[PDB]
């Protein structure tokens with residue numbers, strides 16, 4: 336059949352948004368999470384109607400199969416049940432009735448984190464140490480919230496983190512291989528846990544304080560795991576403090592048991608931010 | 612006929628399988644063994660898809676005849692009954708109490724079951740699986756997807772093969788099956804080498820940290836997986852012989868069972 340659902344089983348929640356006010360635009364980001372497209376909806380905020388608002392629409396790929404539609408609908412329901420948080424790409428609407436499936440989510444005016452930092456390097460809006468710490472604390476708080484809802488990240492890194500007009504860091508992908516980013520136990524056993532996500536967040540912080548730097552440069556993938564099991568971790572970023580680098584290294588602890596929980600990280604980063 | 616089973620004993624319960632092979636499902640038959648009068652035995656039912664098509668109704672019966680001709684073997688998931696005539700097709704096959712191999716070892720590693728595996732136990736599993744594969748090779752039998760998941764462990768800790776037909780898991784396919792698109796028993800020997808690797812690493816993902824996209828060209832460079840910690844130089848050389856670049860030079864399954872018998876007799 337098709338995603339217009341001639342004989343498929345939908346439902347009708349309140350989240351629905353009139354498709355008569357949605358306008359789709361340019362594909363945004365290489366669609367690993369799915370077919371995302373920029374859009375200019377009208378009256379999504381419910382308190383400022385008639386005001387044009389940019390959003391991102393998740394739609395089905397041209398050769399999508401039934402299981403892709405089921406995954407999209409289940410992802411929609413998961414985003415509904417997850418809840419709201421300031422440091423996350425939040426669900427704000429959907430079009431499910433009398434037409435194709437469109438999941439309307441929050442749009443960040445400024446690109447992913449990697450290119451944001453890279454375009455704000457001192458070779459405009461220069462990124463100073465305090466901005467980096469605030470950013471890190473933001474998405475760490477978001478990571479904790481996502482941890483509460485038993486969520487595991489598909490690929491956590493700078494290119495999958497967005498930043499809005501208000502410079503608010505938002506996390507995506509909370510649902511090819513990012514071997515350069517995953518922990519040794521996730522490389523070897525291919526199991527992803529909150530501890531593996533702590534290691535991934537350590538790599539994320541490294542990428543932040545190096546202002547969009549490629550992890551493990553020059554080390555081949557075939558060798559990577561071995562070097563990681565030897566205990567070789569990435570070196571300290573240029574403009575970074577010994578305490579933040581020790582935090583990164585604790586996130587990269589060889590055993591998951593001794594890695595700090597996300598709440599520990601949020602507390603430590605709040606204390607560091609307290610001293611501007 | 613002789614294999615027919617009464618319909619008043621089977622149940623639905625849990626799927627007990629994540630696709631492939633068929634629509635496996637849990638069941639609890641009663642008095643299936645001729646020696647055990649009435650004690651219930653847990654079994655697996657290979658039932659037909661809801662979208663019963665023209666070829667599936669023939670494919671499931673082809674699998675039935677397959678299990679009938681293949682015979683019985685200790686290290687094989689064996690057919691032990693079925694419900695065919697005057698009702699829906701329920702194929703009753705052996706049941707593994709302890710789950711698949713991957714999770715079986717993964718849950719018995721040193722710091723879940725509190726019985727660590729011994730190198731003794733690993734050599735025994737390898738010998739069992741080679742002894743099963745040599746029989747499956749004796750019959751014109753083909754392995755569809757040889758991996759740790761498709762190998763099961765009963766409550767008696769007996770390795771059982773759960774994939775085979777009759778005349779993509781890229782990390783398990785041989786280079787000739789990957790590049791030349793040719794399938795022979797030697798590719799099965801390569802897959803058995805990868806299985807050995809994931810056994811002696813106690814449920815480890817082959818080529819860790821290597822994505823498939825680069826794995827292709829790395830294999831073309833001659834890259835083979837490193838030796839496991841719990842493996843020996845002799846057994847690692849065995850795995851690397853299973854991974855011989857020239858299929859004709861790979862060891863036959865009978866050579867493998869002989870060598871594993873030789874090593875297993877040690878310290879015993």
Ligand SMILES: *C[C@@H](C)C(=O)Nc1ccc(-c2c(-c3ccc(Oc4nccc(C)n4)cc3)c3c(N)ncnc3n2C)cc1
Pocket residue numbers: 363364365366367368371391393410424440441442443444446447494495496497506507508509510
């Ligand atoms: C594969 C990798 C290199 C990559 O490019 N990932 C990627 C794709 C798209 C964006 C993106 C997004 C965006 C991100 C995620 C969704 O859907 C979604 N959100 C949260 C949770 C789940 C399970 N799915 C939709 C869009 C946006 C948005 N929303 N606004 C602005 N810019 C964006 N970009 C670049 C990012 C990384």
Ligand SMILES: *C[C@@H](C)C(=O)Nc1ccc(-c2c(-c3ccc(Oc4nccc(C)n4)cc3)c3c(N)ncnc3n2C)cc1
Pocket residue numbers: 627628629630631632633635654655657674688689704705706707708710711760761762763772773774775776
């Ligand atoms: C696709 C892959 C990731 C996977 O999960 N395969 C898979 C499916 C089912 C089980 C399984 C079984 C089991 C396995 C195979 C059959 O059918 C069959 N047996 C022998 C020969 C042939 C041609 N077909 C039926 C069931 C069992 C059983 N029987 N008991 C207990 N637990 C089981 N599991 C998990 C395993 C892996």
